[PDB]
Amino acid sequence: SQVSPTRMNLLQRRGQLRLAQKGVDLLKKKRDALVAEFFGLVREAMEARKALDQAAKEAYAALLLAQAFDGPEVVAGAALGVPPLEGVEAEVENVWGSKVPRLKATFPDGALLSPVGTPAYTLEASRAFRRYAEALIRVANTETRLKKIGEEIKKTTRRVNALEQVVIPGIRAQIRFIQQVLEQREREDTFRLKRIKGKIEAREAEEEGG
């Protein structure tokens, strides 16, 4: 049905190996860079997280049975709610491992400025909102980085896997198949040329005999 020609195809399939092997060489160290730096961000992430998780909650959990009627008061003095449509600051960024968007969680929420209410807890709960915001930026960058480094990792293992099967020995067997048929064609050459020789000698053998 669809079968490869020998003479036309030859030159394409020899440069096929040149093109492939070199391309894949550098393709290799292309993602390697990006994963080495990625360890750096995942580790560093949680640094602020242990510190500020606990000092947020410090006041929160100590303002639940002194709240549920001082809930009103606390929300009043403080800076009103973050917008539900893009209260966060979304950033777009094109990078290898496809176009993945990032973002940083910084918005207003105030701190140490609610008037009236519980002496300590009110103000301490308001201040705590910062320790959500700030802390959240770390996870804001690593969970979006996670989706980028997903793309790379998967495409990487894909190419290796693929290459060692369909591609590489296939781009081989093409030269081989070609070769062998070019070669074998030249049996008929020699056989014909043989019989040609036989004629020639047979002709000069009628001058001197029969």
């Binding site: 990792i153 293992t157 894909r158 896997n161 693929a162």
Partner: protein, 114 residues
């Protein structure tokens, strides 16, 4: 010995064999081993292609059968196994696959060796 049966294909597989001409379950355990390994090695293709996986929990059992058939069965050194010893223990690796997901072996033989 390294024998891979997946590119292997024989001419007869129910001739010179049958109930009492070899063992009653020889004929049964033939086709069984074949499609069982198959569905193991198959997965190990598709894992690279997407994520680091390509399996559920109903794939994970056929998965261990490609390890099980491996160094336990295929490998043996040069030790002589008997026609008994072969199929007998071939049913201890077939305990790891669900018996309700077997379709290449008959049910009356499930009750003879489990």
């Amino acid at each position: 010995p390294p024998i891979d049966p997946l590119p292997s294909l024989s001419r007869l597989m129910n001739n010179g064999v049958g109930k009492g001409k070899t063992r009653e379950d020889h004929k049964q355990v033939s086709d069984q081993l074949y499609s069982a390994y198959a569905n193991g090695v198959d997965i190990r293709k598709l894992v690279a292609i997407i994520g680091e996986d390509a399996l559920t929990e109903n794939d994970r059992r056929y998965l261990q059968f490609a390890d099980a058939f491996e160094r336990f069965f295929i490998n043996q050194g040069q030790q002589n196994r008997s026609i008994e010893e072969s199929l007998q223990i071939a049913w201890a690796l077939l305990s790891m696959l669900p018996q309700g997901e077997l379709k290449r072996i008959s049910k009356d033989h499930i009750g003879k060796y489990y």
